[PDB]
Design a protein that fits this description.
The chain is an alpha+beta fold and 247 residues long. The chain has two domains: 74 residues, no CATH class; 173 residues, no CATH class. The protein contains nine helices and nine strands. The strands form three sheets. It has a five-stranded antiparallel β-sheet. Strands 6-9 form a two-stranded antiparallel ribbon. A hairpin with a 2-residue loop joins strand 1 and strand 2. Bound molecules: the ligand COc1cc(N2CCN(C)CC2)ccc1Nc1ncc2c(n1)N(C)c1ccccc1C(=O)N2CC(F)(F)F. It comes from Homo sapiens. This is Serine/threonine-protein kinase DCLK1. Probable kinase that may be involved in a calcium-signaling pathway controlling neuronal migration in the developing brain. May also participate in functions of the mature nervous system. Belongs to the protein kinase superfamily. CAMK Ser/Thr protein kinase family. CaMK subfamily.
């Protein structure tokens, strides 16, 4: 039961519920998410603040006593997880363009002291004409050191596992894990569940042969600095955005 929404939008098929939406004024297609709670209240507060071309935007929200309505950008290219599956490996020029998108989104979030802490291929949508980061369910504002161990372990930084306290740079660690997966088809820390944790805490970035023989040393160098165990020495999003591989 929308009302003010029906005057501005034309709801279509269905994909909490998700349905296609069409903006009357622009003829642009949008997604409408119908949600029937402090953690949900927190997530929408970030959605209102974050506006970047490499982030899935929240166009508007209507809050009613029974349910909650969100109109958001619709991306038809699917998530990076599915795209990685069919192609397996990407060219260096394609992958650096994606890192440009992800690092741009990360830099913007960190200028707001927001850590996403759920940066994985399923949450990166692909746009035909780009990447967009989404799902801020784990996102938060870094008032101090964080200690909760959340996120899909393959992309989780060693300080999260160590439980000694983490901050904004865990998003950079995930960005290096993704870029690594983009260039060779497999993650830098693999495990066999406990084995995965010792690989991350050791933090040894390797570039096996034959897979990494063609990839340039500029890419290996950047990936190394993104995947540093020393958080202070680990790259910031600005340092990623100024690297020659990204430009
Ligand atoms: C045709 O479009 C798609 C197809 C696939 N398939 C994946 C599976 N294979 C088998 C078939 C293709 C996956 C995603 C999309 N598009 C899409 N566009 C916008 C999203 C969104 N999904 N979802 C699901 C999100 C997923 C991750 C992060 C953010 C969002 C997010 O906030 N929104 C806005 C809202 F949620 F409101 F819909």
């Amino acid at each position: 039961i929308p009302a003010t929404i029906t005057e501005r939008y034309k709801v279509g098929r269905t994909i909490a519920v998700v349905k296609e939406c069409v903006e009357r004024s622009t003829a642009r297609e949008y997604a409408l998410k119908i949600i029937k709670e402090h953690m949900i209240q927190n997530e929408v507060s970030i959605l209102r603040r974050v506006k970047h071309p490499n982030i899935v935007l929240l166009i508007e929200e209507m809050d009613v006593p029974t349910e909650l309505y969100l109109v958001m950008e619709l991306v038809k290219g699917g998530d990076l997880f599915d795209a990685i599956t069919s192609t397996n490996k990407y060219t260096e020029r394609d992958a650096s363009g994606m890192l440009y998108n992800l690092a741009s989104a990360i830099k913007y979030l960190h200028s707001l002291n927001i850590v996403h802490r759920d940066i994985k291929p399923e949450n990166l949508l692909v746009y035909e004409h780009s990447l967009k980061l989404g799902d801020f369910g784990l996102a938060t504002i870094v008032d101090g050191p964080l200690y909760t161990v959340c996120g899909t372990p393959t992309y989780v930084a060693p300080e999260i596992i160590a439980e000694t306290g983490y901050g904004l740079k865990v998003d950079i660690w995930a960005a290096g894990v993704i870029t690594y997966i983009l260039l060779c088809g497999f993650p830098p820390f693999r495990g066999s569940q406990e084995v995965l944790f010792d690989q991350i805490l050791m933090g040894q970035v390797d570039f096996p042969s034959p897979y990494w023989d063609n990839v340039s040393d500029s890419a290996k160098e950047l990936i190394t600095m993104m995947l540093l165990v020393d958080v202070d020495q680990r790259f910031s999003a600005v340092q990623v955005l100024e690297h020659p591989w990204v430009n």
